Amino acid sequence: MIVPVRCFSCGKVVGDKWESYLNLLQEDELDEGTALSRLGLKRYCCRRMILTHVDLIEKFLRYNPLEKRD
Amino acid sequence: KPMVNESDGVTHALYPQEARLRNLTYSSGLFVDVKKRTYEAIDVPGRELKYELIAEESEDDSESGKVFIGRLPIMLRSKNCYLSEATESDLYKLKECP
Amino acid sequence: KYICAECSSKLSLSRTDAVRCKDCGHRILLKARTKRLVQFEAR
Predict the structure, then answer these.
(1) Residue B2's CB: how many other CB atoms inside 10 A?
(2) Nearest CA in chain A to B92
(3) Which A-chain residues 51-70 have CB contacts (< 8 A) with chain C?
(4) What is the domain extent for residue A3?
(5) Under DSSP, is residue B90 helix (H, G, I), strand (E, B) or coil?
(6) Residue C14 distance to chain B (closest CA, Å)
(7) Which of A17, B60, B79, B95 is 20 to 30 Å from B50 by CA-CA measure?
(8) Which intervals hold the zinc fingers (C4-type) (chain C)?
(9) For chain A, what is the domain count?
């Protein structure tokens, strides 16, 4: 499920930063805290938004709405 | 392996998606060999009956010897089921949840 | 109109035709969404 566009608490916008955040994690091999602070996420609620996100859109995408089995 | 015969008499392997959507029953068929023997004796009063082999029907040399006996349900992912050896792409193209 | 379930082939079926796909021969057929978008008000 694609990243929330806005922060549920302070109204800020975090939706656009997900793509750039993923870059710092393996291209620059940085840790999670410094990467989170590199993008201006300073309140811990924005860090909560980005840090604990389960990206489920890459699993539905390998799939079709037609013929799942059980 | 599990399979289904439609009302038209056509036979096709049954997969869990079709069983789920079409309200079928995931099951397979059981085949058992059967042999028959007939013995005949002369009933002489006061004497023990001595039967002798005369006729023995055994079709082990032909595919007609397998008597169909019934249908048995199959539990998912067991040895017989098609899902046993499916890889991730196999599960996706058949549309399983990994 | 309808659509196949494996190859999603575009098919049209009458009220008497068999419910099958012409190319793959499957027995599972899906509808097609209303081509003309219709506006609504949620009440």
Answers:
(1) 21
(2) A63
(3) 66-67
(4) 1-66
(5) helix
(6) 21
(7) B60
(8) 4-24
(9) 1
